[PDB]
Write a protein that binds this DNA or RNA. Structure first.
Ligand SMILES: [K+]
Ligand SMILES: [Mg+2]
Ligand SMILES: [Mg+2]
Ligand SMILES: [Mg+2]
Ligand SMILES: [Mg+2]
Ligand SMILES: [Mg+2]
Ligand SMILES: [Mg+2]
Ligand SMILES: [Mg+2]
Ligand SMILES: [Mg+2]
Ligand SMILES: [Mg+2]
Ligand SMILES: [Mg+2]
Ligand SMILES: [Mg+2]
Ligand SMILES: [Mg+2]
Ligand SMILES: [Mg+2]
Ligand SMILES: [Mg+2]
Ligand SMILES: [Mg+2]
Ligand SMILES: [Mg+2]
Ligand SMILES: [Mg+2]
Ligand SMILES: [Mg+2]
Ligand SMILES: [Mg+2]
Ligand SMILES: [Mg+2]
Ligand SMILES: [Mg+2]
Ligand SMILES: [Mg+2]
Ligand SMILES: [Mg+2]
Ligand SMILES: [Mg+2]
Ligand SMILES: [Mg+2]
Ligand SMILES: [Mg+2]
Ligand SMILES: [Mg+2]
Ligand SMILES: [Mg+2]
Ligand SMILES: [Mg+2]
Ligand SMILES: [Mg+2]
Ligand SMILES: [Mg+2]
Ligand SMILES: [Mg+2]
Ligand SMILES: [Mg+2]
Lengths: 386, 63, 136
RNA sequence: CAGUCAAGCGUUCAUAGCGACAUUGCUUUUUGAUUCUUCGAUGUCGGCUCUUCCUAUCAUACCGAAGCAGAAUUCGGUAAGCGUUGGAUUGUUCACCCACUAAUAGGGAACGUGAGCUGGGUUUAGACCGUCGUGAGACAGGUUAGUUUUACCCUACUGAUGAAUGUUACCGCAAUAGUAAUUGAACUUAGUACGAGAGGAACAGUUCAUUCGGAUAAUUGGUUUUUGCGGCUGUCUGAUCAGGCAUUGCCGCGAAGCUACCAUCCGCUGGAUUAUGGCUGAACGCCUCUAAGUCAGAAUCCAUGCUAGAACGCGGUGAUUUC
RNA sequence: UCUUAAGGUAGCCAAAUGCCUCGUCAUCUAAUUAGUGACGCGCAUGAAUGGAUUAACGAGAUUCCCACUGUCCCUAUCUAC
RNA sequence: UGAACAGCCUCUAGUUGAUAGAAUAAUGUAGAUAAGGGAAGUCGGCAAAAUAGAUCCGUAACUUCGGGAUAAGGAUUGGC
């Protein structure tokens, strides 16, 4: 018989299977559509989620009650030291799909990226790319041949970049290597832009600008095996239920004589790849810039780092991106920031954002001071004498 | 962007921090955290709580 | 929110489900209002309709004038007591839950309001705003 | 539940909407009929929970018709994409009413679903009543009390490893499979169109909200073996200091972590179509959206986008054992 | 008038007994097939097969109210095994 | 301690036995806490919570005059 009361389904059948992602670095599965007219540029960037803080800003939204009034907003800080371009890939179009034709690497690779090619770096003799580095023996004629092949063929060109993980407060030491598509200019122009940027660094302000809407691609926080009450959000069974109430009561009808693929069942929660879109960049901060956290309305001499540092992460010494709201992934997690796939004219986008104040109180408790000077000015002299 | 003052402890309140409580006689109390809110709800005297601004003012500490 | 409501209300945390008895803040003669419905509420299995500040609800009077009792009438919630967050970041709440008897258009049956009134309720309901004394 | 005819109703008028007398069907969600399967047992009502399917569509999209001025309605097409509720009384299916709502449509899945629950009902043995019976006792009559067992196997499903491919490492492709957003209000349009008046829209724009989904923890709240700090009782260590025990002794606060429409953020744009309205245009020297050809066009479809990645689909690239 | 041995008195009641039936009226509620109070041609109430009442008592059945709460809205978190 | 052969701690006496180690997923069994609401849950407040000792106030209907009664409903409580 019928259900007797309609209720929408629990969960989303388009986020299946709820399995662990194949890698800790979620892959960019679609790049912005190329425009040959614009100058050659990167389509995404790599970074590490540091943590969240709070801002206050004036809201510019005519017709809303809070027009020209101050709003408190949560933001997420991503530590984005400049990436290093080390390689270029050529992709040819085939009836079976886009196929890699060849890769060309830079003459010199750093240790933090060479570590990526080893499982046991300390035991190794570190022979990686030693014979490849000999292709630049006389004039790099092999490199020129491969670049010529990429120019002749290869409708799509991507550059291999690696993070500068040594500039982050992380214990990892092993940089993350990723392919980032080049948008703009002809194929030869893209190949050149890779060739004169081998072993050079690319700053985040050359890829992203203020107020821009971007996408965050990251693997979410892991939670291990979860039951259906929290993995799928089903109703808890009554208190009187024999043999357990954190379950689905009926996992199927007698016919079909099987458990459906669409019935909620316990298993792995979290550690899923997620592409979240339409996050507004509130600040592109610079590492070589004291007073990152100072604004026009503030001029309070302070960086972006909270008192005691970002909890479980550390301190921001490099360039950073401030995105409104939250993004998938936890602190210290590698996150890829991608340019918007379409043009957004919703007037929630394309609205210039001017920060008035950035919160730098301690997140390790109920922080009540923004700077040590403020704390000392409030509390006076303590027994601990500096 | 006004820095408010805790009605129990005298702590400075930055935007989004703590709570605001409207009493039945429409008197407004601001609290920087649930500690000040809880002691106020417990009807503790701020003048008898050693770490508050009223206490240090009354006992002339750090002046 | 609803008929006679001036503009739209940004979402307020719901603190008053169906069955809540809230104080009656006007001088109509009623002592409390029993919430039986919320105007503009959605549909979900097992989910109670719940009211917040500035909502029009349908209520009965359990204590008060006998000519007011045993009837269904509209009311507007004027004090919440469940903590809610304004857009400017402040979480706030009152001691009690309070409402005023209204007609469906949004005029108060009584002529005065006892105690404070939420700002969202005053901005939505001009008759409440004009009858009210201190707003928050 | 649907059709054919059309007496009559509908001021005038069979067919806008109805539709008698008749009559043709369809369905299997009622109740019967039958007795083919099961009596070395297929757990026998409902509710709760959860998934999916059907369409004979209540709402939402786009439309055609009206006795369609407007508003509100009614009939109908494509259409099941997406929703279809909170309660009082009843074990109830059903019913009825209160109320919100865009709407509170109808059904199936062994009258879906009891090694999922519950045990209200029904359905052993106790007991009472009424009627019946000489009586023992009977009563889809009422009432009260009455043990709800077993998964560790196989498959299915949810997640998790993994031999083999010269090895090992990194970067990738994308077959296939899945897929998602939904609905309302307020402002403006506008007291405008329309209407004698009474009344009274719509498109474009703007701000919010509902239902759902994905995440996230700066803030607020909750949680506390941080047994972290303090307090308190009883007892014990001669007192003090500092501690034990009271199965986490109790109370206040309590970071971190986890977490809540109890918190915050985010949820794409292209093509081809349906219905329908057309262009050109014969058949049929006229006409005709159709026959050849062709243009718009839906909550539809397929992509874009999103999830997984074939562990017997593939590519690029690094190093490949000097006793 | 017919017929009985005599035709149900006092009481009591849709009652744990009333089929029709969710009886009708009132009250209780926003709404009540539940409860209570009335009514009574009572399928089929009724006088030691005891009738009617009844303070006190009851791990008996039932309805409402106050208090109270994770029963629920709507879940979350912690400890031991 | 306390009204107490209650509960809790200690002395004499006795035992230190019950397969162990590691780790802290889901679902359990036992123990708990919860913002706002407060029975909307359910056949049904089932389960849980709330109350609670002592002192002093104050206690209705009804009654077989004995009760009802700790009715109901309040105030206080440490140490020195
Ligand atoms: K807290
Ligand atoms: Mg059981
Ligand atoms: Mg924190
Ligand atoms: Mg329900
Ligand atoms: Mg047979
Ligand atoms: Mg058999
Ligand atoms: Mg037999
Ligand atoms: Mg079976
Ligand atoms: Mg149809
Ligand atoms: Mg119910
Ligand atoms: Mg069945
Ligand atoms: Mg069973
Ligand atoms: Mg079964
Ligand atoms: Mg039973
Ligand atoms: Mg029996
Ligand atoms: Mg596909
Ligand atoms: Mg969630
Ligand atoms: Mg001992
Ligand atoms: Mg013991
Ligand atoms: Mg023509
Ligand atoms: Mg593979
Ligand atoms: Mg008589
Ligand atoms: Mg009732
Ligand atoms: Mg009665
Ligand atoms: Mg009778
Ligand atoms: Mg007894
Ligand atoms: Mg003594
Ligand atoms: Mg002991
Ligand atoms: Mg033991
Ligand atoms: Mg609570
Ligand atoms: Mg109920
Ligand atoms: Mg019931
Ligand atoms: Mg109990
Ligand atoms: Mg009594």
């Amino acid at each position: 018989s019928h259900r007797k009361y309609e209720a929408p389904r629990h969960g989303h059948l388009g986020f299946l299977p709820r399995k662990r992602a194949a890698s800790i670095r979620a892959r960019v599965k679609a790049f912005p559509k190329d425009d040959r007219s614009k100058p050659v540029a990167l389509t995404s960037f790599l970074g590490y989620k540091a943590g969240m803080t709070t801002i206050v800003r004036d809201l510019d939204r005519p017709g809303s009650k809070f027009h020209k009034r101050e709003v408190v907003e949560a933001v997420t800080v991503v530590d984005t030291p400049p990436v290093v371009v080390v390689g270029v890939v050529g992709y040819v179009e085939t009836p079976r799909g886009l196929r890699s034709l060849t890769t060309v690497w830079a003459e010199h690779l750093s240790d933090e990226v060479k570590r990526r090619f080893y499982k046991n770096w300390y035991k190794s003799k570190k022979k990686a790319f030693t014979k490849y580095s000999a292709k630049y023996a006389q004039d790099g004629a092999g490199i020129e041949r491969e670049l010529a092949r990429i120019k002749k063929y290869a409708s799509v060109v991507r550059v291999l970049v690696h993070t500068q993980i040594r500039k982050t407060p992380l214990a990892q030491k092993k940089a993350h290597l990723a392919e980032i598509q080049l948008n703009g200019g002809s194929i030869s122009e893209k190949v050149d832009w890779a060739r004169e940027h081998f072993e050079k660094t690319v700053a985040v302000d050359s890829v992203f600008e203020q107020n821009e809407m971007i996408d965050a691609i990251a693997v979410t926080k892991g939670h291990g095996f979860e039951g259906v009450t929290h993995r799928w959000g089903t109703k808890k069974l009554p208190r009187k239920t024999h043999r357990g109430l954190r379950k689905v009561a009926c996992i199927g009808a007698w016919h079909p004589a099987h458990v459906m693929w669409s019935v909620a069942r316990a298993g792995q929660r979290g550690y899923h790849s997620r592409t979240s879109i339409n996050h507004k960049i509130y600040r592109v901060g610079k590492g070589d810039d004291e007073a990152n956290g100072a604004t026009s309305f503030d001029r309070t001499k302070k960086t972006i780092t909270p008192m005691g540092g970002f909890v479980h992460y550390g301190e921001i010494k490099n360039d950073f991106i401030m995105v409104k709201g939250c993004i998938p992934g936890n602190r210290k997690r590698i996150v890829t920031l991608r340019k918007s796939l379409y043009t957004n004219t919703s007037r929630k986008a394309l609205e210039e954002v001017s920060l008035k104040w950035i919160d730098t109180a301690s997140k390790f408790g109920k922080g009540r001071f923004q700077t040590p000077a403020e704390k000392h000015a409030f509390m006076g002299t303590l027994k601990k004498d500096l | 962007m006004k820095v408010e003052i805790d009605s129990f402890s005298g702590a400075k309140i930055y935007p989004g921090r703590g709570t605001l409580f409207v009493r039945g006689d429409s008197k407004i109390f601001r609290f920087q955290n649930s500690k000040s809110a809880s002691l106020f709800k417990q009807r503790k005297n701020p003048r008898r709580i050693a770490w508050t601004v009223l206490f240090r003012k009354h006992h002339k500490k750090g002046i | 929110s609803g008929n006679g409501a001036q503009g739209t209300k940004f979402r307020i945390s719901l603190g008053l489900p169906v069955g809540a008895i809230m104080n009656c803040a006007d001088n109509s003669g009623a002592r409390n209002l029993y919430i039986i419905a919320v105007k503009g509420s959605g549909s979900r299995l097992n989910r109670l309709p719940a009211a917040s500040l500035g909502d029009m609800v349908m209520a009965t009077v359990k204590k008060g004038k006998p000519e007011l009792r045993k009837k269904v009438m509209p009311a507007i919630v004027v004090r919440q007591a469940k903590s809610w967050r304004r857009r400017d970041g402040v979480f706030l709440y009152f001691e009690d839950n309070a409402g005023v008897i209204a007609n469906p258009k949004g005029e108060m049956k009584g002529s005065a309001i006892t105690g404070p009134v939420g700002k969202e309720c005053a901005d939505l309901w001009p008759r409440v705003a004009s009858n009210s004394g201190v707003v928050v």
